[PDB]
């Protein structure tokens with residue numbers, strides 16, 4: 001379930017086999033140094049050996065740092081956890097800042113336990129359940145068939161109850177899990193003898209299964225370390241996995257879970273797949289959060305943390321002194337910083353074209369040139385937002401292409417930051433000032 | 444003569460023992476409610492002709 005979002009146009013970092021960034025691949029344009037560094041961090045995550053590294057992405061706004069993070073996440077793909085949080089999310093009311101950071105850190109480490117299960121699959125021939133009225137004894141047998149074999153099973157009480165609940169019939173192809181006991185109705189083999197109700201609701205036939213009736217299959221259970229901690233914190237922690245309200249889990253629970261998971265890894269029962277934690281706008285975090293991050297990165301069960309910042313020198317929250325990146329020197333000492341630069345005219349043009357392709361907006365050459373000039377003049381994101389409005393204006397005109405006049409109308413209707421600032425300065429009396437004064441009347 | 448008598452007696456005893464073991468197993472397999480009414484639900488594939 002997704003819609004066309006800001007970073008929906010990038011499917012990866014777009015790198016070669018030697019980590020050399022392509023000029024334009026997988027949705028990303030330019031940022032060759034940044035993309036190479038992101039690929040190095042990608043390989044570091046995929047190796048799974050280096051623990052608790054911190055990496056910072058710095059640069060001016062609209063330089064693609066969040067795009068770089070989304071590219072890293074897409075290259076990681078599924079099965080490798082990626083926890084995207086903002087600096088504002090830590091400050092909660094039910095949990096402490098340190099507890100929220102601990103939970104965010106543990107959300108990025110995945111534990112995989114693989115199990116082998118026996119599955120019975122086939123098309124039912126005959127089902128027969130005999131139960132005595134006003135009596136608890138039930139006796140039943142079923143005949144489940146496959147293309148090459150057919151057999152009869154005499155059923156216990158629980159299997160009889162499960163099949164009665166599932167409403168299994170003759171023309172049903174079902175699967176039975178001998179361990180769990182769940183019955184899944186895969187489909188139908190033929191019609192239901194033309195009774196009145198439910199006349200033609202079974203037309204979507206499914207083919208009869210083929211092969212051994214009882215076959216073994218493997219099932220992988222992937223659960224993050226934080227989920228295990230929440231489950232083992234209290235008896236009602238399982239509800240807390242969905243409701244929230246996990247509380248502040250006692251440190252002994254986390255230590256014991258760490259020891260148990262290490263034992264599982266040494267035993268081969270579980271596979272640990274560390275991931276990446278991504279903090280948007282880390283400058284919103286307090287100095288206490290930065291100290292905890294400093295210490296918690298030294299743990300052996302820690303993920304790789306990547307942060308985005310554009311503040312330059314700024315006051316660290318919780319302190320009264322300015323810091324090089326809005327972060328204390330202690331955190332800067334243990335983090336590798338990857339930088340981003342402003343975009344050329346050509347890079348802006350090709351990013352606009354990529355966005356137009358993703359938004360399914362067909363731009364004429366002159367319209368694209370005008371949009372590129374506007375983006376260089378005002379902002380990349382401004383032109384990106386203008387594309388869709390221009391498409392809507394063109395649709396209002398009953399035209400299937402965006403021309404220069406549609407972009408001109410969109411430019412006239414919707415303003416940039418600079419034009420709004422100019423209009424405010426020219427008409428300052430019509431707006432409420434910081435001193436709380438405004439003129440409402442026009443005379 | 445006496446040994447033949449004893450041998451046929453032993454053969455009959457052995458046959459009786461084995462048959463009784465089989466009958467006991469069958470009686471064990473037939474464990475259900477005695478002489479009670481039973482409600483049965485059956486589903487089966489039915490062949491059809493015009």
Ligand SMILES: Nc1ncnc2c1ncn2[C@@H]1O[C@H](COP(=O)(O)OP(=O)(O)O)[C@@H](O)[C@H]1O
Nearest residue numbers: 006007027028029031061062063064065066067
């Ligand atoms: N190198 C790039 N390749 C492709 N698209 C980019 C690139 N850099 C930025 N963009 C696009 O421009 C927009 C910039 O967004 P974002 O990355 O959040 O800016 P910032 O780097 O300031 O956080 C995104 O919607 C992204 O799709």
Ligand SMILES: [Mg+2]
Nearest residue numbers: 065066067308
């Ligand atoms: Mg961003």
